Design a protein around this motif. Structure first.
Motif, PDB file in Angstrom:
ATOM      1  N   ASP B  21       0.802  -1.247   0.000  1.00  9.96           N
ATOM      2  CA  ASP B  21       0.000   0.000   0.000  1.00  9.96           C
ATOM      3  C   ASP B  21       0.832   1.294   0.000  1.00  9.96           C
ATOM      4  O   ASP B  21       0.495   2.276   0.668  1.00  9.96           O
ATOM      5  N   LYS B  22       1.879   1.348  -0.818  1.00  7.42           N
ATOM      6  CA  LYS B  22       2.652   2.570  -1.010  1.00  7.42           C
ATOM      7  C   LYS B  22       2.430   3.087  -2.423  1.00  7.42           C
ATOM      8  O   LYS B  22       2.690   2.372  -3.398  1.00  7.42           O
ATOM      9  N   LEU B  23       1.964   4.329  -2.528  1.00  8.66           N
ATOM     10  CA  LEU B  23       1.719   4.940  -3.826  1.00  8.66           C
ATOM     11  C   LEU B  23       3.036   5.336  -4.478  1.00  8.66           C
ATOM     12  O   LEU B  23       3.880   5.987  -3.854  1.00  8.66           O
TER      13      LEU B  23
ATOM     14  N   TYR E  74       3.847   4.983  10.247  1.00  2.00           N
ATOM     15  CA  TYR E  74       2.907   4.329   9.338  1.00  2.00           C
ATOM     16  C   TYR E  74       1.778   3.653  10.102  1.00  2.00           C
ATOM     17  O   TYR E  74       0.705   3.398   9.544  1.00  2.00           O
ATOM     18  N   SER E  75       2.011   3.341  11.377  1.00  3.75           N
ATOM     19  CA  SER E  75       0.943   2.840  12.229  1.00  3.75           C
ATOM     20  C   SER E  75      -0.116   3.909  12.465  1.00  3.75           C
ATOM     21  O   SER E  75      -1.313   3.664  12.281  1.00  3.75           O
ATOM     22  N   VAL E  76       0.305   5.110  12.865  1.00  4.91           N
ATOM     23  CA  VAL E  76      -0.689   6.098  13.286  1.00  4.91           C
ATOM     24  C   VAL E  76      -1.193   6.984  12.140  1.00  4.91           C
ATOM     25  O   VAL E  76      -2.403   7.208  12.015  1.00  4.91           O
ATOM     26  N   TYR E  77      -0.298   7.479  11.287  1.00  3.20           N
ATOM     27  CA  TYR E  77      -0.662   8.341  10.164  1.00  3.20           C
ATOM     28  C   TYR E  77      -0.317   7.586   8.890  1.00  3.20           C
ATOM     29  O   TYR E  77       0.856   7.374   8.579  1.00  3.20           O
ATOM     30  N   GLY E  78      -1.341   7.190   8.141  1.00  2.72           N
ATOM     31  CA  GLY E  78      -1.147   6.315   6.999  1.00  2.72           C
ATOM     32  C   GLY E  78      -0.387   6.981   5.867  1.00  2.72           C
ATOM     33  O   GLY E  78      -0.054   8.166   5.895  1.00  2.72           O
ATOM     34  N   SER E  79      -0.089   6.170   4.852  1.00  5.59           N
ATOM     35  CA  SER E  79       0.636   6.646   3.680  1.00  5.59           C
ATOM     36  C   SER E  79      -0.186   7.698   2.949  1.00  5.59           C
ATOM     37  O   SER E  79      -1.246   7.396   2.392  1.00  5.59           O
ATOM     38  N   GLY E  80       0.308   8.934   2.958  1.00  4.84           N
ATOM     39  CA  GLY E  80      -0.443  10.063   2.459  1.00  4.84           C
ATOM     40  C   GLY E  80      -0.586  10.065   0.951  1.00  4.84           C
ATOM     41  O   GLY E  80      -0.034   9.233   0.230  1.00  4.84           O
ATOM     42  N   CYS E  95       7.046  10.897   5.229  1.00  2.87           N
ATOM     43  CA  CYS E  95       7.614  10.050   6.273  1.00  2.87           C
ATOM     44  C   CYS E  95       9.093  10.350   6.486  1.00  2.87           C
ATOM     45  O   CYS E  95       9.594  10.265   7.614  1.00  2.87           O
ATOM     46  N   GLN E  96       9.799  10.732   5.421  1.00  4.04           N
ATOM     47  CA  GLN E  96      11.189  11.146   5.569  1.00  4.04           C
ATOM     48  C   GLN E  96      11.309  12.446   6.357  1.00  4.04           C
ATOM     49  O   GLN E  96      12.160  12.556   7.246  1.00  4.04           O
ATOM     50  N   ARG E  97      10.476  13.439   6.036  1.00  2.86           N
ATOM     51  CA  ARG E  97      10.429  14.675   6.813  1.00  2.86           C
ATOM     52  C   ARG E  97      10.175  14.374   8.283  1.00  2.86           C
ATOM     53  O   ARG E  97      10.860  14.907   9.170  1.00  2.86           O
ATOM     54  N   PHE E  98       9.246  13.444   8.539  1.00  4.80           N
ATOM     55  CA  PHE E  98       8.963  12.977   9.892  1.00  4.80           C
ATOM     56  C   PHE E  98      10.206  12.403  10.564  1.00  4.80           C
ATOM     57  O   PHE E  98      10.477  12.713  11.732  1.00  4.80           O
ATOM     58  N   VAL E  99      10.971  11.561   9.855  1.00  9.62           N
ATOM     59  CA  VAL E  99      12.084  10.895  10.530  1.00  9.62           C
ATOM     60  C   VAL E  99      13.212  11.885  10.837  1.00  9.62           C
ATOM     61  O   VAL E  99      13.779  11.850  11.940  1.00  9.62           O
ATOM     62  N   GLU E 100      13.518  12.828   9.923  1.00 12.29           N
ATOM     63  CA  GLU E 100      14.590  13.761  10.290  1.00 12.29           C
ATOM     64  C   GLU E 100      14.147  14.714  11.393  1.00 12.29           C
ATOM     65  O   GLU E 100      14.975  15.151  12.200  1.00 12.29           O
ATOM     66  N   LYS E 101      12.861  15.069  11.453  1.00 14.89           N
ATOM     67  CA  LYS E 101      12.499  16.044  12.479  1.00 14.89           C
ATOM     68  C   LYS E 101      12.320  15.379  13.844  1.00 14.89           C
ATOM     69  O   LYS E 101      12.608  15.991  14.888  1.00 14.89           O
ATOM     70  N   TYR E 102      11.931  14.099  13.854  1.00 16.16           N
ATOM     71  CA  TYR E 102      12.074  13.291  15.060  1.00 16.16           C
ATOM     72  C   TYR E 102      13.528  13.253  15.514  1.00 16.16           C
ATOM     73  O   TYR E 102      13.823  13.447  16.701  1.00 16.16           O
ATOM     74  N   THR E 103      14.453  13.073  14.566  1.00 18.03           N
ATOM     75  CA  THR E 103      15.868  13.013  14.915  1.00 18.03           C
ATOM     76  C   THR E 103      16.398  14.357  15.422  1.00 18.03           C
ATOM     77  O   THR E 103      17.249  14.378  16.320  1.00 18.03           O
TER      78      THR E 103
END
Ligand code: ZN
Ligand code: ZN
Lengths: 217, 97, 57, 96, 126, 107, 215
Positions: B21-23, E74-80, E95-103
């Motif tokens: 399920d990845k676009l 990906y558990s809480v906020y699905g693939s946009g 998700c990449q933006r998410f991972v660097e800003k978590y870091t």
């Protein structure tokens, strides 16, 4: 006095400077590191593989780079010494590319059904005085039933060196120069064709300038 | 110089996570009748049926969106020692751009 | 192949290769040894390897 | 060296699938649920491939059905016509 | 002549041996190149065998801390709806933006992962 | 082949002798002239027309011997040599290439 | 020219056919070698024995092996090999021992050039497994140079004829390892009961040490 034009590349390490032809970035963007799944692995490609990402396998590109350097060096030395290299694949997707690469260089391509006894019963199949190829390059070592190739076995039979692109589901056992890398994707196959064609050509004109200098002295 | 592991972690295909399920966007590169052969990156190509709605803007080089159900499509059967590989991924075409 | 772990213990030159020849004063030799424990490993190997040579000589 | 992969237990591990009654208490007196897992026409207990239950739960459904039928809570040869209305959970298709 | 026994050794061993014995008069074209630049492994035939008992492959699974926090993302906020590209390098996803800003919140320094998630989530909303 | 060359020379001298032989000292003696001439001179009478006398040029008489496919260095000429079906597979590759670039452009 | 060909077995081998019935097909096995190490065996099958011989010898000279020799007179060590159901025990032997070996092994090692070994075969004495097990062992010999390169130490010989003089045979081509070999007291090696029987003298046989002809 010709043993100098037949022995100076043999003492000059990286005589054709083929190291400037490829980098780990080039292989990575050509998607060489990608492989098959963990169920499509071979025990003899277990040494050449970096690891598994989500049941998808990745080949070690440093080992790929070193093996590709050795393979391209051997290929260039053979094209310098005017051998015959048989480019073999059973893709049906890259058959056009392999054969056109051979015709852009001057070398030979077998991308069709390998009839039994081509390399082994060669004198009766072709003629009594045929020179068999002095180097065989498999760009895809597997046939279309995913089995190691009869010409891999037959090159081992008739003592012809073999340079072969081995994937995760391949057998590098009887290949003299295995290059552990992806051969299932157009970018990787195109980069392999480009590097091998460049190596064959640069070897041939480097030869040509060498005996040009030899005849002028 | 950067290492192969550096390339791996700063590669998008590792940043994917699981393939399901990845676009993804992709290019059409081969067409027979109505079987569109799309690449999406990764090792193999997917093949999709031509969508009958808007069915003429699916040509050689067109960018299309895929759901990408699977990356490899292999399985093992009753007596086999390895998997039977399709040499093809699984994806569902959504549309254009 | 001869049966056993170490077939050399039954080759008549190992037996006449042991070194201890007891004096005529001794009559009984008793070897109390422990099958387990890292400290009695020497006694276990002595029972395993040297008692046939001692008895043969 | 900061970039080599590190050992850990699998992330993105989906939690293990749970059967429909998994965590629920089945009784021989629960002849609405046992009637769900009994066939409407013949009274046959459905198999694992139809019910879709885990091994423990399927065993308890079988034992509870046999108990209820011998104690006098369930008909043997048919499903309760009062219970041919409840939510169907079995992967069987009779009509066409 | 030549030797068609592929399982006893390699072509290099067979050829060097036959020209030492004196049955192959002329050395083949590839022999001196092989002697100058031999590969990393001599191609001797090896029979593939199945691992049977407590034998496992030496392969490890590629995993990261970034993969763990990608998993919880990906558990809480699905693939946009922002689709992934995969054809250009340096593609930076959501998700990449998410991972660097978590870091970056980690390298600034905070403790509890739920608090880190709430701070990075409101920062994504910003 | 030198066999073919001296056979061609022999056929030329023989057809000259044949025309002078019958009536036709002018240089133009056609093939059907040759056939009717040998038919008169040797009464065939065999039911197989290939068992009858024939006087043709050695190109038609002798079959098509394929030329040498490699020079005095090994190194065979056509690049699709080791397939063993070089002309047929070259024809496949050529028709395939025209189909490919035609798709790219578009008894 | 320098290759000599010796037959090792000729068998009349039959198969059944729908029309003919028993159809005789001669199957032969030959070995070809020159007395310098290169030798090889092959099977030729034909309807005529001359054709079978010709096919067999040409196929063997296409299928040669090599056998490393100690001083071109004996093998490097003692070789024990079980090929299928044929057990072969061969021993390196000093100069002048002769060829006290099974008659096929005598012919094959005259073709190879080996002069001084002992060979006892057991299990099934089948010629076609005997020859192949012989070639497998002689081609999977380890030499002293390869041994020294593997261990990293000197290879020396101690003859009873010369005395306590150490005679170095093979030295490593790279570095010399400096820790000594681990003296494993009472080693774990599998001995042979026939060897131990002969060493201790309860091998009572009226056939073993018989005065035979040369080689
Ligand atoms: Zn593959
Ligand atoms: Zn359950």
């Amino acid at each position: 006095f010709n043993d100098k034009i037949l022995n100076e590349p043999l003492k000059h390490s990286d005589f054709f400077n083929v190291k400037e032809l490829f980098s780990v970035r080039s292989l990575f963007d050509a998607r060489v590191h990608l492989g098959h799944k963990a169920g499509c692995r071979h025990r003899f490609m277990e040494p050449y593989i970096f690891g598994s990402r989500l049941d998808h396998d990745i080949i070690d590109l440093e080992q790929t780079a070193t093996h590709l350097q050795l393979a391209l060096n051997f290929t260039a030395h053979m094209a310098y010494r005017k051998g015959i290299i048989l480019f073999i694949s059973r893709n049906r997707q890259f058959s056009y590319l392999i054969e056109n690469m051979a015709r852009d260089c001057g070398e030979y391509a077998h991308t069709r059904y390998f009839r039994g006894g081509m390399l082994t019963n060669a004198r009766l199949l072709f003629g009594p005085t045929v020179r068999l190829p002095d180097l065989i390059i498999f760009l895809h070592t597997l046939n279309n039933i995913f089995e190691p190739h009869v010409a891999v076995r037959d090159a081992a039979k008739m003592n012809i060196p073999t340079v072969g692109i081995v994937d995760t589901n391949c057998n590098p056992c009887l290949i003299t120069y295995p290059v552990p890398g992806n051969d299932d994707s157009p970018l990787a196959v195109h980069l392999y064709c480009r590097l091998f064609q460049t190596a064959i050509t640069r070897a041939k004109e480097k030869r040509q300038q060498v005996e040009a200098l030899y005849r002028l002295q | 110089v950067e290492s192969f592991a550096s390339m791996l972690r700063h590669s998008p295909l590792t940043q994917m996570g699981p393939a399901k399920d990845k676009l993804v966007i992709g290019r059409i590169f081969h067409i027979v009748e109505n079987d569109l052969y799309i690449d999406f990156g990764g090792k193999f190509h997917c093949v999709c049926r031509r969508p009958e709605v808007d069915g003429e803007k699916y040509q050689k080089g067109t960018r299309v969106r895929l759901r990408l159900l699977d990356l490899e499509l292999t399985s093992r059967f009753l007596g086999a020692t390895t998997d039977t590989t399709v040499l093809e991924a699984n994806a569902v075409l959504l549309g254009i751009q | 192949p001869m049966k056993g772990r170490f077939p050399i213990r039954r080759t008549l030159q190992y037996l006449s290769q042991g070194n201890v020849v007891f004096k005529d004063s001794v009559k009984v030799m008793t070897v109390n040894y422990n099958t387990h424990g890292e400290l009695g490993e020497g006694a276990r190997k002595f029972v395993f390897f040297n008692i046939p040579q001692i008895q043969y000589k | 060296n900061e970039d080599l992969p590190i050992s850990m237990e699998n992330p993105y591990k989906e939690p293990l699938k749970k059967c429909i009654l998994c965590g629920k208490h089945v009784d021989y007196k629960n002849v609405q649920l046992l009637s769900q897992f009994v066939s409407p026409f013949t009274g046959c207990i459905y198999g694992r491939h139809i019910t879709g239950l885990c091994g423990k739960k399927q065993k308890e459904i079988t034992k509870a059905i046999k108990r209820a039928q011998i104690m006098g809570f369930m008909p043997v040869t048919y499903k309760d016509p009062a219970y041919l209305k409840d939510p169907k959970v079995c992967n069987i298709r009779y009509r066409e | 002549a030549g030797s068609r026994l592929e399982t006893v050794g390699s072509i290099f061993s067979r050829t060097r041996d036959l020209v030492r014995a004196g049955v192959l008069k002329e050395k083949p074209l590839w022999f001196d190149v092989y002697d100058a630049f031999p590969p990393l492994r001599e191609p001797v035939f090896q029979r593939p065998r199945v691992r049977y008992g407590k034998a496992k492959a030496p392969i490890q699974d590629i995993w990261y801390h970034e993969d763990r926090i990608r998993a919880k993302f990906y558990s809480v906020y699905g693939s946009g709806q922002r689709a992934f590209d995969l054809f250009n390098p340096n593609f930076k996803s959501t998700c990449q933006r998410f991972v660097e800003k978590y870091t970056e919140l980690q390298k600034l320094g905070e403790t509890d992962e739920e608090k880190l998630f709430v701070e990075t989530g409101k920062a994504l909303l910003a | 082949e030198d066999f073919i060359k001296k056979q061609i020379e022999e056929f030329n001298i023989g057809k000259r002798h044949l025309a002078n032989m019958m009536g036709e000292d002018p240089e133009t003696f056609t093939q059907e002239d040759i056939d009717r001439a040998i038919a008169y001179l040797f009464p065939s009478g065999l039911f197989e027309k290939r068992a009858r006398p024939v006087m043709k040029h050695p190109e038609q008489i002798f079959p098509r011997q394929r030329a040498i496919q490699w020079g005095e260095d090994g190194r065979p000429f056509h690049y699709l040599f080791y397939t063993g079906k070089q002309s047929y597979y070259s024809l496949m590759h050529d028709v395939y290439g025209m189909l490919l670039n035609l798709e790219k452009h578009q008894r | 020219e320098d290759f000599d060909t010796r037959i090792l077995e000729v068998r009349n081998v039959f198969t059944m056919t729908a029309k003919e019935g028993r159809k005789k097909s001669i199957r032969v096995l030959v070995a070809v070698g020159n007395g310098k190490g290169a030798a090889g065996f092959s099977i030729g099958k034909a309807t005529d024995r001359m054709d079978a011989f010709r096919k067999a010898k040409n196929r063997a000279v296409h299928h040669l092996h090599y056998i490393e020799r100690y001083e071109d007179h004996t093998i490097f060590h003692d070789i024990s090999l079980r090929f299928k159901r044929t057990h072969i025990k061969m021993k390196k032997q000093p100069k002048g021992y002769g060829l006290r070996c099974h008659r096929a092994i005598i012919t094959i090692c005259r073709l190879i050039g080996i002069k001084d070994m002992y060979a006892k075969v057991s299990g099934s004495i089948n010629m076609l497994s005997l020859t192949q097990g012989l070639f497998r062992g002689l081609s999977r010999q380890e030499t002293h140079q390869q041994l020294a390169d593997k261990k990293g130490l000197h290879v020396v010989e101690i003859r009873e004829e010369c005395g306590p003089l150490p005679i170095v045979v093979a030295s490593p081509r790279g570095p010399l390892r400096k820790d000594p070999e681990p003296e494993d007291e009472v080693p774990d090696v599998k001995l042979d009961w026939e060897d131990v029987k002969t060493a201790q003298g309860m091998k009572r046989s009226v056939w073993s040490n018989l005065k035979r002809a040369a080689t």
